[PDB]
């Protein structure tokens, strides 16, 4: 049943098994899918930065042809000349990656599965067990009533909340969330980091939120990612400038919104 | 093939088989899913009232992990502290229930399956056969050009129309409708009851419609449900008061709408 | 795996095998699904005209119960009296058809599969191989900045572009497109014909576009379809009259739109 959902790449698996043999602690796995709420593209930016900047290769491939609804989110063909020249498969993969140090870690990403989340969670549990994963770490942005002119708040959640140095709510499920819940029920350590992203900047990239999340992750896992922190820092500068001019040049109501949210923020702590 | 879609709870099945042994007529099954048009939440109110008020337990469990698209309708996790504390599975179940008398009946409900309706209908046919179901009964609200100030009309439909004491249309299918159609083709008695709900109150609870449907059901099946009829009656009083003040305090056009629909209604019969 | 997705009708298959025995060239297959962009209903009109006008029968039936999301596009039941009298199955079928000559060809149509496009493409490849298909031909409308007062442009694409007597883009995939891409990778000849349909008439029937596409198809395949060309020609006359009166009687901005698009059109070639 759940094992039918994925297959192993021997190269990636050999390299993992050699990391496991040389370090008894085991590996961290980061995971994040594209398809649920992710205010400010906080998780999406991090996924992009990892896969674009760091050396990696596949270790397990999920069967996206069974898991991904193609009419709902239509993968891109490329047209060149006259004919189809290429196709972006909507892959869902566990990759072996190295940080700037050369330290190995795992990274599970692609489109959020549309279906069969219980079987998918159970598959991810077998992968976590087979690859000696010691900690699984999810991350995303949630839109909040907070100002862009104050630092990004975060909500760490899961069983390893202690790694990031009153509340009872119902949240629409996502595949990562159910994966996290099933992993914890099986005894595995989970953390998650949700960035608090200002509602009114939520539907573009908010690099400050990706940066603040990347530094909680890096602080919690011991992974070292200075090039990515730097690129995000740079984007955040450009983005704060753009946001300032928008508010400054807009509506009275929008100005009054930011000041009203600043006041709420400063009055709390 | 269709048997893979569900499994039996032995406790619930034993209790059913003992009901079957003591009454040769067999049982009635009510069924209603969440996911198609149900003006006034007519079916939804009845589902809620049954499952909340009457003693019941599972007899068959469908494989919701195969049948329910999780990204389209995302089941709720609960967050408590710091971490996921619980999860509302999107279950699809045939339950044994007793009315206020202690008379047994079956109740099939949960999210409307998104996929595989032919295999699902055929599974429900095997369940209906194995559990000695004598009558299957669906129920929902359809939005109509009728006034809230006149009684709820109903359209009984199916092979047992006689149980509720000119027309040729194409209707978007729903899982219950295709189940009803396949059951009838296999010789099984089906009724359905559609409440006529005023368009302009259709997108909230319209307890009058649930009440009028509950009393056709109860009259057609011999089931006795006075506590539920009472709670619905009470809600309907509150709801008629709210609607009256809305129309009375709104637009000229809305007042003119209700009077125009009253006139149409009174001129017919 | 892919063979589970369809079954053969022996009658249709015998008649195909006899066509194959009498003509070594093999057959052409046209295919077009309902569910992706098709400006002006260009492909839809052709599908309708073929299936309504020409003698045909099933050769292969796909398992729509696995491939078609029923809640997303709900097949029609028919209500008559009092009860369900009929049901429009959302079939996906390869049909044997004859043109006005009696020349055989194949026609694959129904709702675009929602899921499992890789397995579906591979199934269509086995069907193309088993039925001696020499050319597979897709066709649809794309909305463009062009005037309704100038002829319909077309973009032929695929490996047999030569049959219809600078450009590098990413296009959302559709099932036909991925089928075309997999077929070409397996050595099979594909053509496609996309009609350029004026944006502002795109969301109804634009018979001129179906006609222009039908004549490229007919010219590329050697099929003869004069009755269908005639009906489309007739609709196009009615449609050009309706569009002229709309523009003529509308906004200054809409008049200025058509003239601005005419100017762009005439300045190119
Ligand atoms: Mg969907
Ligand atoms: Mg599916």
Residue numbers in the entry:
A (entry chain A), B (entry chain A), C (entry chain A): 3 to 167, 173 to 276
Task: Please give sentences taken from the publication describing this entry.
Among these actinobacteria-specific proteins, five proteins (corresponding to ML1009, ML1306, ML1029, ML0257 and ML0642 from the genome of Mycobacterium leprae TN) were found in every sequenced actinobacterial species including those from the deepest branch Rubrobacter xylanophilus and also from intracellular pathogens such as Tropheryma whipplei which have highly reduced genomes. All five of these proteins are conserved within actinobacteria but have no known function. These five actinobacteria-specific proteins are referred to in this work as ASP-1, 2, 3, 4 and 5. We report here the crystal structure of SCO1997 from S. coelicolor, which corresponds to the protein ML1009 from M. leprae (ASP1).
The crystal structure of full length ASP1 was determined using Seleno-methionine (SeMet) derivatized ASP1 and single anomalous diffraction (SAD) techniques. The final model was refined with native data (2.2 Ǻ) to R and Rfree values of 17.4% and 23.4%, respectively. Crystals grew in space group I23 and contained a single copy of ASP1 in the asymmetric unit. As well, when analyzed by size exclusion chromatography, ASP1 eluted with a Stokes radius consistent with a molecular mass equivalent to ~125 kDa (monomer 36 kDa), further supporting the idea that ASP1 exists as a trimer in solution. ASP1 contains a single domain comprised of a central mixed β-sheet (β1–3-6-7-2-8-10-9) flanked by 4 α-helices on one side and 3 on the other yielding an overall three layered αβα fold. Trimer formation is largely stabilized by interactions between an extended anti-parallel hairpin (β4–5) and the αD region from an adjacent monomer. The first Mg2+ ion is positioned just above a negative ring of amino acids formed by three copies of D71 and D116. Structural and phylogenetic analysis indicates that although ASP1 retains a similar overall fold compared to members of the hydrolase superfamily such as purine nucleoside phosphorylase, the active site region and therefore function of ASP1 are distinct.
